[PDB]
């Protein structure tokens, strides 16, 4: 049988095996060197079109031969030597001189019109254009380049909901011309979003079908009912004809996906919100986190789509209000723009009001996002959560948002089934790891923080009672004996943050 390299050669040189070649010419020359059978030759000799005899010749060949010899020793004799020279060139720039393969025998045939074909057939989404986050898309392309050599690997492009990961992945497979063609031959991009236990099987059913030829999509059997070992075997079967194939698994929630990805020795890019799914894999795992949009980048994004830049001081302030509120978040920022109707800074501050007195539902809009509002997204992130973590999260409302505060200051509102409350930290960590709902910050002192988007989510969403109960449950422990953290001589008075507390009490008197 061959392998991924010799088949990468047979795959790269396919435009050519289509432009000048014929399997009838080779069947006779090949029954001799022992690489066929009279049914193999039966199947390939009587076929109406040539692309049929070719697809059967390259499939049967990729399975039957002990090596890629008796196919160099043929394009030669048949005056189609212009083929066997290309393939021997590739195998030589593969066994003897490595590295040189990407610059020399693979790149001089790139074409920005073949890419779009390959992207489209691999279901890659149409990269964003009016703004590109340089840094991230770049480091993705980089870390993908570093691994095309590797046999199987996970790249985790993880972030908040609406934090912009998938779009960045769309751009990373659309920016370079290297990743598809030079570093990897093909792309298969499949969206997961599986919650049920049958989802993790159906996905790889649609992988199996993302792989399969336009022929025998007709023949698809009642595979809906067929064991996992068989769908898996069917894939690693049909996966031979697929040398260096990249897999994007957009929006993974279940680590069972990742386990299949790791049993199937697949090459995977992965966008997800819960980062801990990587513990499922005992392997080369590499990570890229999509942080919240920095204050300057938000400017960049707005200018990028035609938004008028400030002059008066309370206009740059209006936009810092927006950037603060939507605590650096692509999606709600976009909804924000889409809903700014007249375009005035005025109606933008109108919305800035609307966000505090109606939550995300005040700016929910039709956006390139599948979601009307970021709350629909965070929804799932909150359902999946460990029941206890669901509790911790449910209580983190009654904090100050966009304020760095100690663990003990959290131990007061946060639940627990003695004298050391570190368990709070463990939960709040799980909480930031799994949808980036919190925010961990090791020194000066162990402190977490809840952002603003992630707060106004909870505001108009948690049980109206639990707010006032958390506020009182806070005012209890509250007594016993700026770019600066609140000191331990002064925890007894949270009154510093009275503003954002007078607001929840006014909220809970309605």
């Amino acid at each position: 049988m061959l392998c991924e390299i010799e088949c990468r050669a047979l795959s790269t040189a396919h435009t050519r095996l289509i432009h000048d070649f014929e399997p009838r010419d080779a069947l006779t020359y090949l029954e001799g060197k022992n690489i066929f059978t009279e049914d193999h030759s039966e199947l390939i000799s009587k076929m109406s079109t040539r692309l049929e005899r070719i697809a059967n010749f390259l499939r049967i060949y990729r399975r039957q031969a002990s090596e890629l010899g008796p196919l160099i020793d043929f394009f030669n004799y048949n005056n189609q030597s212009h083929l066997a020279d290309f393939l021997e060139d590739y195998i030589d720039f593969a066994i003897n001189e490595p590295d040189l393969l990407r610059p020399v025998v693979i790149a001089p045939q790139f074409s920005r019109q073949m890419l779009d074909r390959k992207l489209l057939l691999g279901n890659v989404p149409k990269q964003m254009t009016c703004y590109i986050r340089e840094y991230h898309v770049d480091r993705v392309i980089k870390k993908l380049d570093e691994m095309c050599d590797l046999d199987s690997f996970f790249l985790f492009l993880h972030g908040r909901a609406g934090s912009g990961k998938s779009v960045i992945a769309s751009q990373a497979l659309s920016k370079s011309d290297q990743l598809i063609g030079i570093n990897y031959d093909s792309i298969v991009w499949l969206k997961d979003s599986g919650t049920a236990p049958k989802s993790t099987f159906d996905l790889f059913t649609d992988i199996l079908l993302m792989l399969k030829s336009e022929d025998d999509l007709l023949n698809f059997p009642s595979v809906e009912h067929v064991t996992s070992v068989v769908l898996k075997r069917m894939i690693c079967n049909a996966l031979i004809d697929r040398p260096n194939t990249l897999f994007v698994f957009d929006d993974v929630v279940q680590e069972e996906t990742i386990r299949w990805a790791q049993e199937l020795r697949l090459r995977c890019l992965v966008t997800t919100r819960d980062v801990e799914i990587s513990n499922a894999a005992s392997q080369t795992c590499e990570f890229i986190e999509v942080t919240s949009l920095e204050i300057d980048e938000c400017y960049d994004f707005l200018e990028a789509y035609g938004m008028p830049m400030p002059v008066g001081e309370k206009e740059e302030d209006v936009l810092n209000k927006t950037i603060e509120l939507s605590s650096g978040n692509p999606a709600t920022l976009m909804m924000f723009f889409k809903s700014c109707e007249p375009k005035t800074f005025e109606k933008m501050a109108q919305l800035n009001n609307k966000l505090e007195s109606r939550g995300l539902v005040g700016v929910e809009c039709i956006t390139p996002y599948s979601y009307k509002s970021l709350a629909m997204a965070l929804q799932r992130c909150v359902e999946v959560l460990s029941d206890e973590d669901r509790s911790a999260l449910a209580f983190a409302v009654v904090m100050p948002p966009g304020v760095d505060i100690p663990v003990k200051l959290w131990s007061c509102v946060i639940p627990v089934d003695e004298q050391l409350d570190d368990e709070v930290a463990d939960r709040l960590k799980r909480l930031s790891k799994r949808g980036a709902l919190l925010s961990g910050k090791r020194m000066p002192v162990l402190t977490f923080k809840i952002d603003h988007i992630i707060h106004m989510f909870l505001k108009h969403v948690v049980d109206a009672q639990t707010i006032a109960n958390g506020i009182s449950i806070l005012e209890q422990r509250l007594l016993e004996i700026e770019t600066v953290i609140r000191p331990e001589d002064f925890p007894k008075f949270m009154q510093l943050h009275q503003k954002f507390y007078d607001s929840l009490k006014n909220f809970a008197c309605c």
Binding site: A375, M376, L378, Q379, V382, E383, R390, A394, F457, V461, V462, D463, Q465, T466
Partner: peptide
């Protein structure tokens, strides 16, 4: 009620 239908 502990979460207005999760959100």
């Amino acid at each position: 009620p502990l979460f207005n239908f999760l959100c």
